[PDB]
Design a protein around this ligand. Structure first.
Ligand SMILES: Nc1ncnc2c1ncn2[C@@H]1O[C@H](COP(=O)(O)O)[C@@H](O)[C@H]1O
Ligand SMILES: [Mn+2]
Ligand SMILES: [Zn+2]
Length: 390
């Protein structure tokens, strides 16, 4: 019901302090063209972007040649009958070792991930789905967070195609939490765009090429929950179960129209994307680097102007910074700690005692309840500074 925070069980404790640029969790580097040595270094300051570590597989992604059977129009392979097998649950190092052995014997695999960001500061990968032509695997990325790095042997093997649909964030999530990278990517989203299909979503593809109606009733679900519910297990399996066949049809159509190279180019760039803490994000925002984005109100005085008075912007900002520090401290998301509507509510009514803060017509969060005095003090200070100054 309450769902105990899975972070508590991680072997390596999370760090939201952000005292340095992101450091790749990679310790071993298979399918390497350039030693891991030249990898873990640093790219000292510059106007464009401040000191940071580079993408450990950037070289191979540019140099590693593609498997020849990707440039060939081949007979497509139908997805396996859904009922002919059960998804294989993987949450043990041994189960993980056998799946790995199995993945090494493929020409291509379909991959997907499920993520959670409400009860975590940066967020956490809760599930990984991997399909072969024969079976569907469901990987518990919470319980095997520290072990999953061994999949790099396949995820970076250019001889095996890894099919994802719109992997722009997956690539980010894979390195940030599991130190996994991808070399040999084929993005079906970029494939759909190149061909010019009317719609480019996974759901559109599943409905038209696999006759599977999808449900947006899980892109808001809590993937941290163990065990997975039947309907959630089915929805996760569906993201990769039909993908290899969709891959065949799109690949062939691309070759047939001479647009494959462009898709592979687009895919290599999705794979080269690097993760960095907002504190060290490059000045000019680009699609080559990902830094945490605020899923809420515009930094400081929001545009959702709940009729936010003039003199009350210092207050607004202190609330924002306070919220962020607490979120980072307890490793929670800002909205869990205090949603903008509530932050706005405090600014609008400016309660100055505990009673005023907890009885806010809007209702209150646990963090605001536990810090009611601090907030009432913070607010009282803000007012006094107003009546004063001018
Ligand atoms: N519509 C959405 N709103 C919010 N988060 C989403 C949405 N779609 C996907 N996500 C997040 O992205 C993860 C992967 O979704 P997908 O790319 O559709 O497999 C989910 O488990 C969510 O954490
Ligand atoms: Mn996905
Ligand atoms: Zn999914």
């Amino acid at each position: 019901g309450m769902v105990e925070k899975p972070q508590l069980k991680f072997k390596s404790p999370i760090d939201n302090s952000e005292s340095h640029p992101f450091i790749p969790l990679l310790k071993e580097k298979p399918n390497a063209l350039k030693p891991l040595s030249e990898s873990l270094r640093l790219v000292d300051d510059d106007e464009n972007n401040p000191s940071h570590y580079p993408h450990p597989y950037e070289y191979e992604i540019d140099h590693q040649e593609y498997s020849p059977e990707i440039l060939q129009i081949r007979e497509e392979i139908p997805s396996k009958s859904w009922d002919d097998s059960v998804p294989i649950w993987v949450d043990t190092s041994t189960e993980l070792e056998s799946m790995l052995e199995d993945l090494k014997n493929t020409k291509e695999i379909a991959v997907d991930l499920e993520h959670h960001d409400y009860r975590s500061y940066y967020g956490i990968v809760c599930l990984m789905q991997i399909s072969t032509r024969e079976r569907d695997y469901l990987v518990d990325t919470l319980k095997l967070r520290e072990n999953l790095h061994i999949l790099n042997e396949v995820f970076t093997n250019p001889s095996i195609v890894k099919v994802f649909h719109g992997a722009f964030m997956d690539i980010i999530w894979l390195q940030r939490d599991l130190g996994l990278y991808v070399v040999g990517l084929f993005d079906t989203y970029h494939a759909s765009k190149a061909i010019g299909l009317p719609r480019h979503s996974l759901a559109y593809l599943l409905e038209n090429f696999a006759n599977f109606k999808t449900s947006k009733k899980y892109q808001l679900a809590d993937w941290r929950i163990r065990p997975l519910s039947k309907p959630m297990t089915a929805a996760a399996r569906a993201d990769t179960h039909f993908l290899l066949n969709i891959y065949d049809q799109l690949r062939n159509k691309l070759i047939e129209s001479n647009k494959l190279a462009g898709v592979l180019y687009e895919s290599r760039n999705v794979a080269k994307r690097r993760f960095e803490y907002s504190k060290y994000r490059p000045l000019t925002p680009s699609s080559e680097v990902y830094s945490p984005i605020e899923k809420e109100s515009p930094w400081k005085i929001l545009m959702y102007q709940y009729n936010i008075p003039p003199e009350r912007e210092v207050l607004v900002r202190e609330l924002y910074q306070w919220r962020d520090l607490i979120a980072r401290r307890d490793d929670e998301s800002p909205r869990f700690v205090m949603p903008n509507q509530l932050l706005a509510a405090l600014v609008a009514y400016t309660p100055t005692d505990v009673i005023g803060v907890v009885s806010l017509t809007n209702g209150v969060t646990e963090h605001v309840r536990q810090n009611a005095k601090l907030l009432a003090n913070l607010i009282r200070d803000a007012l006094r500074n107003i009546k004063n100054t001018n």
